Design a protein around this ligand. Sequence first.
Ligand SMILES: CCCCCCCC/C=C\CCCCCCCC(=O)O[C@@H](COC(=O)CCCCCCCCCCCCCCC)COP(=O)([O-])OCC[N+](C)(C)C
Ligand SMILES: CCCCCCCC/C=C\CCCCCCCC(=O)O[C@@H](COC(=O)CCCCCCCCCCCCCCC)COP(=O)([O-])OCC[N+](C)(C)C
Ligand SMILES: CCCCCCCC/C=C\CCCCCCCC(=O)O[C@@H](COC(=O)CCCCCCCCCCCCCCC)COP(=O)([O-])OCC[N+](C)(C)C
Ligand SMILES: CCCCCCCC/C=C\CCCCCCCC(=O)O[C@@H](COC(=O)CCCCCCCCCCCCCCC)COP(=O)([O-])OCC[N+](C)(C)C
Ligand SMILES: CCCCCCCC/C=C\CCCCCCCC(=O)O[C@@H](COC(=O)CCCCCCCCCCCCCCC)COP(=O)([O-])OCC[N+](C)(C)C
Ligand SMILES: CCCCCCCC/C=C\CCCCCCCC(=O)O[C@@H](COC(=O)CCCCCCCCCCCCCCC)COP(=O)([O-])OCC[N+](C)(C)C
Ligand SMILES: CCCCCCCC/C=C\CCCCCCCC(=O)O[C@@H](COC(=O)CCCCCCCCCCCCCCC)COP(=O)([O-])OCC[N+](C)(C)C
Ligand SMILES: *[C@@H]1O[C@H](CO)[C@@H](O[C@@H]2O[C@H](CO)[C@@H](O[C@@H]3O[C@H](CO)[C@@H](O)[C@H](O[C@@H]4O[C@H](CO)[C@@H](O)[C@H](O)[C@@H]4O)[C@@H]3O)[C@H](O)[C@H]2NC(C)=O)[C@H](O)[C@H]1NC(C)=O
Ligand SMILES: O=S1(=O)NCN(C2CC2)c2ccc(F)cc21
Ligand SMILES: O=S1(=O)NCN(C2CC2)c2ccc(F)cc21
Ligand SMILES: C=C(C)[C@H]1CN[C@H](C(=O)O)[C@H]1CC(=O)O
Ligand SMILES: C=C(C)[C@H]1CN[C@H](C(=O)O)[C@H]1CC(=O)O
Ligand SMILES: *[C@@H]1O[C@H](CO)[C@@H](O)[C@H](O)[C@H]1NC(C)=O
Lengths: 32, 152, 309, 117
Amino acid sequence: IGVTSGIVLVLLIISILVQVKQPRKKVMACKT
Amino acid sequence: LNPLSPDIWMYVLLACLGVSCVLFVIARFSPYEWYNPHPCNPDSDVVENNFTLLNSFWFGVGALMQQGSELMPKALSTRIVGGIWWFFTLIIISSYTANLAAFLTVERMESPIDSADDLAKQTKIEYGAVEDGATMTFFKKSKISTYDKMWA
Amino acid sequence: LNPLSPDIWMYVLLACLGVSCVLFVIARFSPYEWYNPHPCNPDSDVVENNFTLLNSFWFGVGALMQQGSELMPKALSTRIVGGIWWFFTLIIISSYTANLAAFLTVERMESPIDSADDLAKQTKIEYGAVEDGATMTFFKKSKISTYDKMWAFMSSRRQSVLVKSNEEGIQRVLTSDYAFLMESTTIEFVTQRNCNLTQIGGLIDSKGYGVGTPMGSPYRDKITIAILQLQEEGKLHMMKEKWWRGNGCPEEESKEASALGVQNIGGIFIVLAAGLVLSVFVAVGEFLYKSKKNAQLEKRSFCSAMVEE
Amino acid sequence: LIDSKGYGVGTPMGSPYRDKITIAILQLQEEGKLHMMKEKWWRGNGCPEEESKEASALGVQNIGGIFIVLAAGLVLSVFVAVGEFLYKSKKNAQLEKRSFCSAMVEELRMSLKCQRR
Ligand SMILES: CCCCCCCC/C=C\CCCCCCCC(=O)O[C@@H](COC(=O)CCCCCCCCCCCCCCC)COP(=O)([O-])OCC[N+](C)(C)C
Ligand SMILES: CCCCCCCC/C=C\CCCCCCCC(=O)O[C@@H](COC(=O)CCCCCCCCCCCCCCC)COP(=O)([O-])OCC[N+](C)(C)C
Ligand SMILES: CCCCCCCC/C=C\CCCCCCCC(=O)O[C@@H](COC(=O)CCCCCCCCCCCCCCC)COP(=O)([O-])OCC[N+](C)(C)C
Ligand SMILES: CCCCCCCC/C=C\CCCCCCCC(=O)O[C@@H](COC(=O)CCCCCCCCCCCCCCC)COP(=O)([O-])OCC[N+](C)(C)C
Ligand SMILES: CCCCCCCC/C=C\CCCCCCCC(=O)O[C@@H](COC(=O)CCCCCCCCCCCCCCC)COP(=O)([O-])OCC[N+](C)(C)C
Ligand SMILES: CCCCCCCC/C=C\CCCCCCCC(=O)O[C@@H](COC(=O)CCCCCCCCCCCCCCC)COP(=O)([O-])OCC[N+](C)(C)C
Ligand SMILES: CCCCCCCC/C=C\CCCCCCCC(=O)O[C@@H](COC(=O)CCCCCCCCCCCCCCC)COP(=O)([O-])OCC[N+](C)(C)C
Ligand SMILES: *[C@@H]1O[C@H](CO)[C@@H](O[C@@H]2O[C@H](CO)[C@@H](O[C@@H]3O[C@H](CO)[C@@H](O)[C@H](O[C@@H]4O[C@H](CO)[C@@H](O)[C@H](O)[C@@H]4O)[C@@H]3O)[C@H](O)[C@H]2NC(C)=O)[C@H](O)[C@H]1NC(C)=O
Ligand SMILES: O=S1(=O)NCN(C2CC2)c2ccc(F)cc21
Ligand SMILES: O=S1(=O)NCN(C2CC2)c2ccc(F)cc21
Ligand SMILES: C=C(C)[C@H]1CN[C@H](C(=O)O)[C@H]1CC(=O)O
Ligand SMILES: C=C(C)[C@H]1CN[C@H](C(=O)O)[C@H]1CC(=O)O
Ligand SMILES: *[C@@H]1O[C@H](CO)[C@@H](O)[C@H](O)[C@H]1NC(C)=O
């Protein structure tokens, strides 16, 4: 629990930083 | 909430946070999930992606609870994520509901000894009668096997 | 993974490859599945078919796992394929989850030895008998293959494995890793009082007790009569049931509550994590097949990859 | 076993052989020949083993015949894709004044596998 909840926390921070920095509809194909 | 151990209820709940972040990264990374909207106007560079961080987490929860959701994945890449999360939540529920039969009863708390036979073989439970009575004198002057061990 | 036999898990997995190839052929062959897209522009000979080889295999897997998929079939022909694959996966899962109740409560380990054959070949488990007994003297004067190797072990180690009594044998089974060779009427008494111990294998030989008399005594023809009389009256069984029973040890004819853990289900977190490591090899594998087809439309496939990142 | 008994070479009452047969049985028993002879006769056909109270997973013997009704539902469906092919070509005749090459050019369009047209 101590190790894998850090790994999931890594995947959670990346998935936020992809969500904030990306206009999911606008033009942006093939990004990240 | 018992038929899975409290480390499994944490490993399932970390898997929903796990797979939905894996599904959101792959859906934005895969070039086939970026479909073109507006089929009525099929000439614009406005290709969109329906997987948000919302909809990725509610494909993970929506398939965990057998009801399913919107946004079936559209790729060879995001359907292996969705296809292996359907096999995960198939077994976790089939392991839950096949173990929950034992935890809605048990067998409602019976006694460790149920006769004088079971009570003769145990040293864990002490037992006696009234001294100088007719119950002590029964075991004193008996010679049947069980009721003489209870006087020994 | 047990409630279906490993030929059924192969017949299910061949049925998904079976039906999805049958569904893809029929969907391209049927003239009613070829619907006309662009309803906003309903005049063009551009009738399309949504069943690819991808989407046919992910109607087969998507309906195998109860969640369903996109592309419900649209025909009288492709809905008999889809309609009979829904009845197939209904019964396979209803047969799985109604049998999985019996396989989550379970068995335990089986001992490293199961006979004197398995115990002869191992040096990992030491073993001995009582010194100057009739069990040691059996292996001393034997010449059969297995029971002479078991004396080749003991004669090298007579200060270590050959205990002095039956009580020093039982304690070294408990306190150590040891495989004491005791006669079968003492094992029936010890392995009912103690519940740590068991009888490995059957009987090595067949022997028997007996009231010993001096060489030529007139009592051995009177003890023989008075034993055969007690045996038909049932007193030699009545005395043995008085002593050799004791505590009639169970443990696991009860099989109580036992919530599931990492010990029971456990390894699906393996095949979950083995399916995601497979998928990151594919997102790279789609990245390379796209950049290879980016080399056709344009130039410098490597920098065509770097711009989109 | 109801009781416990045993065989034995019977000798007359007071024969000098019963103390020599007794020796020659106890000699054969420690050499393992009284077990070697019993394994020669009492085995015969070793009539197949029972697979008692354990697991009993599901095989082709139990569920089994759903692979029949799966395969019987697909042979039904290929009769229908032909049956849709003939009802379409019959209604293709009412706009084309029956040709029977209409059924050819239709099954040409099957081999236009391009996700479209
Ligand atoms: C009780 C359990 C609940 C769990 C839910 C957690 C998953 C879901 C959580 C959050 C979902 C993400 C929100 C994205 C919405 C998109 C909107 C947008 O386009 O831009 C927005 C930027 O706003 C953001 O993008 C915020 C994202 C940063 C933080 C997200 C994770 C927070 C972790 C939380 C804890 C993690 C632990 C989770 C486990 C507990 C601004 O636009 P708008 O003003 O919003 O207008 C929208 C409409 N319009 C764009 C068309 C105009
Ligand atoms: C982008 C990155 C993607 C990956 C992460 C994405 C996040 C995922 C989201 C959530 C994380 C996953 C589940 C939650 C936490 C794990 C829970 C757990 O118990 O551990 C499990 C796995 O972990 C191990 O213990 C290691 C086992 C080694 C082999 C695992 C295969 C992975 C490599 C792939 C091979 C390539 C295959 C390629 C195709 C063939 C199993 O534990 P255990 O050891 O069995 O328990 C001990 C049993 N005992 C106590 C009885 C002794
Ligand atoms: C195959 C042709 C189908 C064509 C499309 C397939 C394409 C691919 C799609 C699916 C592929 C099928 C699954 C793949 C693996 C096969 C399953 C298996 O291994 O054993 C199965 C074999 O059963 C069969 O496969 C069919 C056998 C003939 C059916 C007998 C009755 C005829 C009814 C049809 C006519 C009615 C017409 C309609 C009426 C309205 C189990 O059966 P069994 O083992 O023999 O029985 C056990 C006996 N035992 C106890 C001794 C062991
Ligand atoms: C219907 C779709 C296709 C289905 C495919 C079926 C494949 C299976 C066929 C046969 C299975 C038998 C051979 C497997 C290898 C044997 C090794 C083994 O024992 O298991 C090992 C690996 O186990 C796995 O990881 C499972 C195999 C991969 C499953 C995940 C990817 C496929 C699912 C998505 C499909 C997408 C791909 C399809 C095309 C894009 C686990 O044990 P261990 O790691 O060695 O040790 C752990 C240590 N411990 C024991 C102490 C805890
Ligand atoms: C374990 C297996 C893998 C192991 C490899 C390990 C490392 C992995 C390394 C590399 C991974 C492999 C290459 C990377 C992927 C790129 C390919 C691609 O472009 O896909 C494309 C085509 O794809 C297809 O047409 C085929 C898919 C149909 C079969 C689905 C798989 C199941 C087969 C079961 C296998 C047997 C099961 C037996 C089980 C024992 C998908 O995109 P598209 O269709 O072109 O777009 C639609 C077109 N449209 C836009 C006009 C609408
Ligand atoms: C869509 C259609 C798909 C059809 C595919 C599957 C069809 C069947 C495929 C394979 C079946 C294989 C048959 C076994 C061998 C023949 C024996 C036999 O016939 O049994 C008996 C009849 O039994 C009955 O009385 C019931 C009638 C049959 C079921 C009704 C069809 C369901 C249609 C669904 C409607 C769909 C609409 C529902 C809503 C969607 C007669 O024999 P017996 O002497 O009495 O018994 C001895 C048997 N023994 C000799 C083997 C020992
Ligand atoms: C379990 C076993 C199965 C039981 C199920 C039985 C249930 C009854 C089954 C079907 C009942 C049919 C009702 C018709 C629907 C009414 C609408 C209408 O009038 O126009 C229809 C007639 O136009 C056509 O071209 C006919 C094609 C209909 C589908 C195939 C049935 C005839 C197959 C002939 C050969 C059969 C071979 C037989 C071999 C022996 C067009 O409708 P559509 O095609 O859908 O496309 C337009 C869609 N829309 C209407 C929404 C716009
Ligand atoms: C589950 O099964 C385990 C192995 O199958 C078993 O582990 C064994 O435990 C015993 C202790 O009871 C270990 O004995 C040790 O080894 C030396 C060998 O010389 C002993 O002398 C030593 O002290 C002994 O301990 C006795 C009990 O504590 C005591 O009477 C004396 O002091 C005596 O000297 C060590 O303790 C043995 O090696 C272990 N086997 C292994 C590791 O393979 C577990 O006990 C058993 N648990 C249960 C709950 O059944
Ligand atoms: O040692 S004995 O007296 N004679 C030999 N045997 C073995 C069955 C040959 C038996 C078998 C069972 C016994 F109780 C005694 C003996
Ligand atoms: O008839 S016997 O000589 N005496 C009785 N017994 C033992 C008491 C069981 C046995 C047991 C095994 C035998 F082979 C013979 C006899
Ligand atoms: C209270 C006492 C000692 C009496 C009562 N009747 C029994 C008798 O008359 O022997 C005894 C109880 C018993 O034996 O448990
Ligand atoms: C404990 C001892 C020395 C005795 C017990 N009966 C066997 C006997 O009947 O000679 C011996 C044990 C043995 O040799 O396994
Ligand atoms: C062996 O079984 C007894 C019960 O007879 C139990 O008390 C004990 O904990 C077990 N283990 C050992 C090492 O004695």
